[PDB]
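Input record (Table S2, row 175):
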Amino acid sequence: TTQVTLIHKILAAADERNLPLWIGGGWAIDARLGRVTRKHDDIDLTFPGERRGELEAIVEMLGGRVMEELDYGFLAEIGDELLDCEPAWWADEAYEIAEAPQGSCPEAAEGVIAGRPVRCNSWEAIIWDYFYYADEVPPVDWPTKHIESYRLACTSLGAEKVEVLRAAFRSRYAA
Ligand SMILES: [Cl-]
Ligand SMILES: [Mg+2]
Ligand SMILES: [Mg+2]
Ligand SMILES: [Mg+2]
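Output record (magnesium ion complex):
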């Protein structure tokens, strides 16, 4: 239960600092479902961009380090575990991931991990990121774990909403 214990430690330290953090990616799907559905390669977090130093301080306090700087976030390691961290920026009434559908970082805790309520990115934000992935790697060539996590997110949001979101993504990035 290494990752669950680590998620709880990170969120405890963030709560103490009044620092909201959103679980993202595959763990966000499992958190919203309230069920662990597979083994996860890492823990994805969305953090307030202007408070990055506070997240880095949590990482250091837990004995980890920032490992890799990305174009739109950073990777950290704590022990044998990887954190894939991306910023969200204040947009008047909420934090938002750049270019994501509005509502990407809801204020209420909408998931549960091992009995703990947790903030997590919205289904629309979760699914939106798979759309970027489809432009990168053809979906027919996706690892089955991604195919399965995608279809689970789409079952949870519903086919109607997913079709409309996909169409909006195509219109956004049409050239
Ligand atoms: Cl950043
Ligand atoms: Mg991940
Ligand atoms: Mg990741
Ligand atoms: Mg919402």
